């Protein structure tokens, strides 16, 4: 049908700034496009409509424009409560299309990951499980890889990722990472490795530990 | 006051059917149509489809209809989406909005908080909470496992919640058909093991509270 493009899954900024998000169609719109803001809690809005200009309730602040392919929200001046989710969405041809959307999120300076690792607790393993746990906290930008290794290699199986929002009093981005075994496999190796790469330096952080210095 | 509240959040195994509700007031329920987005973790917000109250008239978008069915209630002034023969796929918020006109073209200009559905076969079950200590220098790490609980949500505090700041609770991730998640609290070396750091995990569906204390060692 027609796709809808936001070139930018998230944008940075501070409060006080010009901020401005894009949205570019697989075709032309004649302008029947809207702008829609999700606030963290979920919940949706209808910030402006028809090919941006549209109001609705909302702030001066927000602005909008655009025609044919092109189209783009601004927010003249940046406040706490719009740090939201936008989406985009064609109202020209069926079916009605959306855009990935762009989330907002506050600048801070670079912070680099507090890399932290856990070997299984006696408490699991005893249950036959194995599972070693590797934190990466405060760190910003929010893109970080993680790599495993088990005895100075592999793994990738078994490990799962979970991630945190920004935070809200600094706006440091936080990193879980957790490889699980089986305590028999787990007791066939000696050194476990929980390898953070950010962007804050070349060399990964490296934090492990030896089954046998245990 | 232009308002749209939707069901409560559903449990159903896949293969099944559901049938969620949208009630408007504040407004003349056979005036406007009513929408229906879908929005997956994975980011982006689908359209279902559309449905006039007034004529019953429908429009799906072709990748949702036949297991999808618009239906409403002028009655009770209440919209209605029932979704059939469910797969791990259309696990998501499923949200209802208002439509409006204005030259050329429609959108929606009020949604509403949305209704989060969850396909799993499995049932409740209680967490299993794992100490995270650190192995045999300011700051030290500390944390905590809970693992193999169903469904959400669970409510891990530390020291009974007097560990505030340096604390982190990650979202939980879908292991074999259960759920895991992880929390991490951060205090000064004078702190632990000098004195009692505790994690305290609820897990309410299985009226479950467990205070794992972090012991040095393994």
């Known amino acids: 049908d027609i796709q809808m493009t936001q070139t930018t899954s998230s944008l940075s900024a501070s409060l006080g700034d010009r901020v401005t998000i894009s949205c570019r169609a697989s075709?032309?719109?004649?302008?029947?496009l809207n702008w829609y803001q999700q606030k963290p809690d979920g919940t949706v809005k209808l910030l402006i409509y028809?090919?941006?200009r549209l109001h609705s309730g909302v702030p001066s602040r927000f602005s909008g424009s655009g025609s044919g392919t092109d189209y783009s929200l601004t927010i003249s001046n940046l406040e706490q409560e719009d740090i939201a989710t936008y989406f985009c969405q064609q109202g020209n041809t069926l079916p009605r299309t959306f855009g990935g959307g762009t989330k907002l999120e506050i600048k801070r300076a670079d912070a680099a990951p507090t890399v932290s690792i856990f070997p299984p607790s006696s408490e699991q393993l005893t249950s036959g499980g194995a599972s070693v746990v590797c934190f990466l906290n405060n760190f910003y930008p929010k893109d970080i890889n993680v790599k495993w290794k088990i005895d100075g290699s592999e793994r990738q199986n078994g490990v799962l990722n979970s991630w945190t929002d920004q935070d809200s009093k600094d706006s440091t981005y936080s990193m879980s990472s957790t490889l699980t075994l089986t305590k028999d496999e787990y007791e066939r190796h000696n050194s476990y490795t929980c390898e953070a790469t950010h962007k804050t330096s070349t060399s990964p952080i490296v934090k492990s530990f030896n089954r046998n210095e245990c | 006051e232009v308002q749209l509240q939707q069901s409560g959040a559903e449990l159903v195994r896949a293969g099944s059917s559901v049938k969620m509700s949208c009630k408007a007031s504040?407004?003349?329920?056979?005036?406007?149509?009513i929408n229906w987005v879908k929005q997956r973790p994975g980011q982006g917000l689908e359209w279902i489809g559309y449905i006039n109250p007034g004529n019953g008239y429908t429009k799906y978008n072709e990748k949702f209809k036949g297991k999808t069915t618009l239906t409403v209630d002028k009655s009770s002034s209440t919209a209605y989406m029932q979704l059939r023969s469910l797969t791990s796929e259309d696990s998501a918020v499923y949200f209802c909005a208002r439509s409006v006109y204005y030259g050329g073209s429609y959108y929606f200009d009020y949604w509403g908080q949305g209704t989060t559905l969850t396909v799993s076969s499995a049932k409740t079950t209680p967490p299993s909470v794992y100490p995270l200590a650190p192995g045999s220098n300011s700051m030290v790490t500390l944390g905590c496992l809970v693992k193999g609980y169903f469904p959400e949500p669970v409510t891990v505090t530390w020291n009974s919640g007097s560990l505030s700041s340096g604390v982190h609770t990650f979202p939980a991730v879908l292991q074999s058909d259960l759920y895991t998640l992880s929390s991490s609290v951060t205090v000064p070396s004078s702190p632990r093991p000098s004195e009692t750091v505790t994690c305290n995990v609820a897990h309410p569906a299985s009226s479950t509270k467990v205070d794992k204390k972090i012991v040095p060692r393994d």
């Open positions: 028809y090919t941006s």
């Open positions: 504040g407004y003349t329920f056979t005036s406007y149509g």
């Open positions: 075709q032309d719109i004649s302008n029947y």
